[PDB]
């Protein structure tokens, strides 16, 4: 159901002239032939608040300086199309909560938010505080934001709304009819729309239990596959978000549909940064196979997805993530120190925004050998708009709005695509997505083997073959592929040269 193929990650305003049809003409001309899917990052209203996307008022309309649903429906129409669904939390700006500050309990919408009642039912303040201290939560939010409801009417009430992120966004109770009928609503605009795969927001919070640590129960797994099974019958296959400890990835795709690899980003730079692939190959011998891969996200790059957790270990270790840590400050030449938050231990650290391609020094023949470790792991391969054209840390962003991953997050306009696609590391960046689009061998059988400073990465499917070879002690990596009734042998240098000299 879905084409097994190179998938592109954008903003709908930040590649090409800013909105949808701007994005759909790049995709038909100068990015033509290259993705089978777009993730498009959140494009509901409004698009460019607080938290770039993730904290809409309304969710369930496009923003229309970005377009309408019409637009993102003809895109889809030859792609697949990857959008976001929070479904944890609804804005506090939004028609549903404005009501229910109106109208209090009289609120036909009032059942649709959780508050404090709806999870702890007693009166010892001291027990609930206990169980409240149990919850899971990832900032030092408000736990409960008291709102005066009914302001409208003759009674008035203060409420403590459960609220995970911040005191706009309420947490909906999922589980009563009106918070199935709010996500299934945005379903139903999705499937209308041509949309394929549905990227699932906070769902880890999604569920409370008084006592618990309200954070991927038992109860939560129940929900998400209620939601994945509904999005199933209307065509579509869910993709359930989390950065966290590698092993908790590994649980989550035993049981839905999709997970990220966060770790190959840390173990990728980490293997060029050493030449020594053997944790990278540790983790593709247990990796979960019903993944999306990804060298850079719109976020930065994930530290702690390879760190240890509690008593459980990380994908390699202590020292060598703090070396990898200090590693990135050094390519990029202290830029993304400055767009990092402070931490104690690098080992701490929740991400590191820089570029990935600033994170390899800007070194192209390296950033070529990653991208094709990443098409030749398994899962669907995505490449990030930026990286896709390897844009360099944006400072100037980063100084004017002084928001970290900013740094990651710049605007390319139509002329500036035109411009990069010149790049010869671009050049040989969309022949590796060819290659990765066209050979049959990727919808079969995997092998990995790393022997004597040598990894290889191997694919079988029909007649169809695919080879990733990467010799660490030569630093030289070779695609052997059969396809066609050829044999063919591409060295990643001898692409990049081409691509300099043509
Ligand atoms: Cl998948
Ligand atoms: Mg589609």
């Given at each position: 159901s879905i084409?097994?193929?190179?998938?592109?990650?954008?903003?709908?305003?930040?590649?090409?002239?800013?909105?949808?049809?701007?994005?759909?003409?790049?995709?038909?001309?100068?990015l033509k032939g290259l993705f089978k899917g777009v993730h498009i990052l959140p494009f509901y209203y409004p698009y460019d608040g607080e938290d770039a996307g993730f904290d809409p008022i309304d969710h369930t309309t496009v923003d229309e300086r970005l377009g309408d649903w019409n637009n993102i429906k003809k895109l889809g129409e030859s792609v697949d199309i990857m959008a976001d669904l929070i479904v944890n939390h609804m804005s506090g700006q939004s028609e549903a909560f404005t009501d229910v500050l109106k109208k209090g309990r009289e609120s036909e919408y009032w059942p649709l938010f959780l508050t404090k009642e709806d999870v702890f039912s007693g009166n010892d303040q001291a027990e609930i505080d206990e169980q409240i201290a149990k919850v899971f939560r990832p900032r030092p939010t408000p736990f409960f934001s008291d709102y005066e409801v009914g302001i409208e009417t003759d009674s008035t009430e203060t409420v403590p709304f459960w609220t995970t992120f911040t005191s706009?966004?309420?947490?909906?109770?999922?589980?009563?009819?009106?918070?199935?009928?709010?996500?299934?609503?945005?379903?139903?605009?999705?499937?209308?729309?041509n949309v394929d795969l549905i990227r699932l927001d906070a769902a880890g919070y999604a569920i409370k239990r008084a006592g618990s640590n309200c954070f991927?129960?038992?109860?939560?797994?129940?929900?998400?596959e209620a939601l994945s099974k509904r999005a199933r019958t209307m065509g579509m296959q869910c993709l359930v978000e989390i950065h966290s400890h590698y092993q908790t990835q590994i649980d989550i795709a035993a049981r839905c549909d999709s997970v990220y690899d966060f770790a190959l980003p840390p173990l990728v730079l980490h293997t060029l940064f050493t030449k020594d692939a053997s944790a990278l190959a540790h983790w593709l011998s247990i990796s979960p196979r019903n993944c999306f891969?990804?060298?850079?996200?719109?976020?930065?790059?994930?530290?702690?997805?390879?760190?240890?957790?509690?008593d459980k270990p990380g994908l390699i270790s202590a020292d060598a993530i703090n070396a990898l840590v200090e590693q990135i400050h050094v390519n990029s030449n202290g830029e993304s120190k400055k767009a990092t938050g402070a931490a104690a231990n690098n080992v701490d650290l929740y991400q590191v925004n820089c570029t990935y391609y600033d994170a390899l020094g800007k070194d192209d023949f390296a950033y070529l050998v990653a991208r094709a470790i990443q098409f030749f792991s398994p899962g669907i391969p995505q490449v990030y708009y930026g990286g896709l054209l390897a844009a360099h840390?944006?400072?100037?962003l980063l100084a004017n709005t002084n928001v970290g991953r900013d740094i990651n997050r710049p605007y390319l306009t139509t002329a500036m695509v035109e411009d990069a696609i010149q790049k010869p590391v671009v050049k040989g960046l969309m022949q590796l997505i060819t290659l990765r689009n066209e050979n049959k061998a990727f919808g079969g059988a995997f092998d990995v083997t790393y022997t004597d400073n040598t990894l290889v990465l191997s694919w079988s499917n029909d007649g169809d073959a695919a080879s990733l070879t990467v010799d660490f002690a030569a630093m030289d990596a070779t695609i052997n592929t059969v396809s066609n009734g050829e044999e063919s042998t591409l060295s990643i240098g001898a692409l990049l040269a081409h691509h300099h000299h043509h």
């Amino acid at each position: 159901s879905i084409r097994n193929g190179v998938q592109l990650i954008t903003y709908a305003d930040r590649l090409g002239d800013g909105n949808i049809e701007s994005l759909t003409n790049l995709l038909d001309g100068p990015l033509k032939g290259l993705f089978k899917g777009v993730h498009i990052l959140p494009f509901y209203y409004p698009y460019d608040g607080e938290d770039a996307g993730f904290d809409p008022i309304d969710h369930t309309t496009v923003d229309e300086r970005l377009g309408d649903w019409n637009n993102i429906k003809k895109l889809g129409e030859s792609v697949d199309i990857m959008a976001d669904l929070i479904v944890n939390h609804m804005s506090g700006q939004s028609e549903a909560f404005t009501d229910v500050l109106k109208k209090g309990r009289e609120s036909e919408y009032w059942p649709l938010f959780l508050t404090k009642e709806d999870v702890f039912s007693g009166n010892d303040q001291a027990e609930i505080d206990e169980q409240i201290a149990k919850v899971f939560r990832p900032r030092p939010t408000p736990f409960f934001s008291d709102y005066e409801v009914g302001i409208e009417t003759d009674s008035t009430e203060t409420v403590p709304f459960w609220t995970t992120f911040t005191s706009n966004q309420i947490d909906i109770d999922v589980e009563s009819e009106l918070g199935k009928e709010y996500l299934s609503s945005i379903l139903q605009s999705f499937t209308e729309s041509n949309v394929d795969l549905i990227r699932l927001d906070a769902a880890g919070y999604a569920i409370k239990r008084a006592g618990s640590n309200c954070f991927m129960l038992e109860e939560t797994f129940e929900f998400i596959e209620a939601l994945s099974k509904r999005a199933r019958t209307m065509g579509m296959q869910c993709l359930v978000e989390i950065h966290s400890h590698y092993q908790t990835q590994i649980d989550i795709a035993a049981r839905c549909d999709s997970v990220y690899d966060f770790a190959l980003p840390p173990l990728v730079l980490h293997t060029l940064f050493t030449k020594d692939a053997s944790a990278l190959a540790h983790w593709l011998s247990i990796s979960p196979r019903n993944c999306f891969t990804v060298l850079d996200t719109h976020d930065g790059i994930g530290i702690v997805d390879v760190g240890a957790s509690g008593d459980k270990p990380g994908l390699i270790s202590a020292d060598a993530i703090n070396a990898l840590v200090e590693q990135i400050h050094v390519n990029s030449n202290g830029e993304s120190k400055k767009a990092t938050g402070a931490a104690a231990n690098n080992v701490d650290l929740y991400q590191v925004n820089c570029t990935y391609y600033d994170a390899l020094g800007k070194d192209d023949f390296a950033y070529l050998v990653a991208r094709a470790i990443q098409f030749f792991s398994p899962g669907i391969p995505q490449v990030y708009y930026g990286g896709l054209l390897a844009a360099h840390n944006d400072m100037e962003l980063l100084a004017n709005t002084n928001v970290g991953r900013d740094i990651n997050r710049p605007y390319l306009t139509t002329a500036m695509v035109e411009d990069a696609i010149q790049k010869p590391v671009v050049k040989g960046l969309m022949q590796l997505i060819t290659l990765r689009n066209e050979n049959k061998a990727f919808g079969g059988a995997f092998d990995v083997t790393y022997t004597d400073n040598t990894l290889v990465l191997s694919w079988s499917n029909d007649g169809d073959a695919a080879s990733l070879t990467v010799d660490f002690a030569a630093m030289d990596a070779t695609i052997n592929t059969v396809s066609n009734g050829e044999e063919s042998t591409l060295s990643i240098g001898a692409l990049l040269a081409h691509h300099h000299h043509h």
